[PDB]
Amino acid sequence: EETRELQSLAAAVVPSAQTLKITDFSFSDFELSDLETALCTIRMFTDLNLVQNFQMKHEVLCRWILSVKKNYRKNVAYHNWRHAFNTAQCMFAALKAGKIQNKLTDLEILALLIAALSHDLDHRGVNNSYIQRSEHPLAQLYCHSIMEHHHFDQCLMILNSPGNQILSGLSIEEYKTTLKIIKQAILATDLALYIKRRGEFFELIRKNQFNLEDPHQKELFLAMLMTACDLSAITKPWPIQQRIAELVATEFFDQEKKNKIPSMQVGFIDAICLQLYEALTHVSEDCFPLLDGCRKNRQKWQALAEQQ
Numbered sequence: 001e002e003t004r005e006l007q008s009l010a011a012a013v014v015p016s017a018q019t020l021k022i023t024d025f026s027f028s029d030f031e032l033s034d035l036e037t038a039l040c041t042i043r044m045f046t047d048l049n050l051v052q053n054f055q056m057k058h059e060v061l062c063r064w065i066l067s068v069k070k071n072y073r074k075n076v077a078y079h080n081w082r083h084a085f086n087t088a089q090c091m092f093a094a095l096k097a098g099k100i101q102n103k104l105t106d107l108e109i110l111a112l113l114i115a116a117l118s119h120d121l122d123h124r125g126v127n128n129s130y131i132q133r134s135e136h137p138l139a140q141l142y143c144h145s146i147m148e149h150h151h152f153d154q155c156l157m158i159l160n161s162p163g164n165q166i167l168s169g170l171s172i173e174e175y176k177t178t179l180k181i182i183k184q185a186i187l188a189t190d191l192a193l194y195i196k197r198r199g200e201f202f203e204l205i206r207k208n209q210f211n212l213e214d215p216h217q218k219e220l221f222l223a224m225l226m227t228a229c230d231l232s233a234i235t236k237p238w239p240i241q242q243r244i245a246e247l248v249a250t251e252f253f254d255q256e257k258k259n260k261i262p263s264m265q266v267g268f269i270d271a272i273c274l275q276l277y278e279a280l281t282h283v284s285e286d287c288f289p290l291l292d293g294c295r296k297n298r299q300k301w302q303a304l305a306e307q308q
């Protein structure tokens with residue numbers, strides 16, 4: 001058992017990117033089995049040249065993927081393996097379809113994919129902070145990045161695990177740089193951090209001073225990209241988005257029915273999502289499909305919200 005799943009995975013052919021649909025921003029995972037997401041994930045690595053460039057062994061990447069999947073909680077409604085998988089998927093799409101691959105280094109890409117996949121490891125549920133309570137008090141500094149420090153702890157734990165060391169093909173200098181960025185990438189998924197840094201990102205777009213050769217503006221962009229992907233369900237074709245909002249809602253009430261939801265989706269869109277997917281689109285307007293999706297979802301939640 002469990003060694004079960006790996007034999008299946010290690011053996012099977014990985015369908016192409018076209019065949020798995022992973023290049024579409026409109027991607028949906030609902031039909032897929034856990035087994036099929038694993039394959040999608042391998043394809044993500046392979047088609048980003050990561051298996052080649054960092055000489056990853058196939059058995060190892062497979063065991064890492066299942067270990068990552070294993071370490072989410074199915075009992076949690078939204079913050080689970082499928083959320084993480086979708087975030088990686090979105091990061092895939094944004095690199096290929098949104099043409100961001102060409103604006104980044106290989107280590108950068110490697111670290112973002114591992115980050116995205118790993119960015120909510122061990123999440124227990126939004127209203128259900130056991131990570132918070134049974135911790136050292138002196139969690140009052142409120143680095144908020146505190147859940148996110150847990151996630152990175154767990155990301156590093158798996159990375160290091162025997163069988164699972166997909167970064168062992170790196171040089172010690174490469175490994176250090178990569179991990180640095182995984183850390184920043186996962187901590188960037190704290191929304192408090194996004195709120196605190198987006199002004200700078202939007203100013204540079206507004207004032208037209210934006211420049212990725214500046215190492216500081218690189219890191220910034222990577223935090224913003226991570227957030228974009230993490231939220232990206234908000235951009236999905238309406239009937240997917242609705243279902244995802246349902247899971248979000250389950251978790252946000254269960255540790256004035258669907259009634260509350262529409263107003264809250266619009267709130268969240270307006271407060272957070274809209275401006276980000278606008279900015280991303282200025283940087284690369286092949287990412288427009290996310291903006292478009294975000295807006296179309298807004299029209300639809302607004303219309304319903306008005307007691308249709």
Ligand SMILES: CN1CCN(CCNc2cc(F)c3c(=O)c4c(-c5nccs5)[nH]c(Cc5ccc6c(c5)OCO6)c4oc3c2)CC1
Binds near residue numbers: 244249252253
């Ligand atoms: C201690 N922790 C506790 C958890 N967290 C709280 C901060 N607030 C947060 C954190 C979040 F990430 C989201 C978030 O990811 C959102 C999304 C998404 N839609 C699509 C993709 S993501 N929709 C809504 C709106 C909403 C909020 C509550 C609801 C509801 C709808 O329906 C019923 O209840 C979101 O609000 C959020 C509020 C961070 C701090």
Ligand SMILES: [Mg+2]
Binds near residue numbers: 120189190
């Ligand atoms: Mg998170």
Ligand SMILES: [Zn+2]
Binds near residue numbers: 119189230
């Ligand atoms: Zn997340």
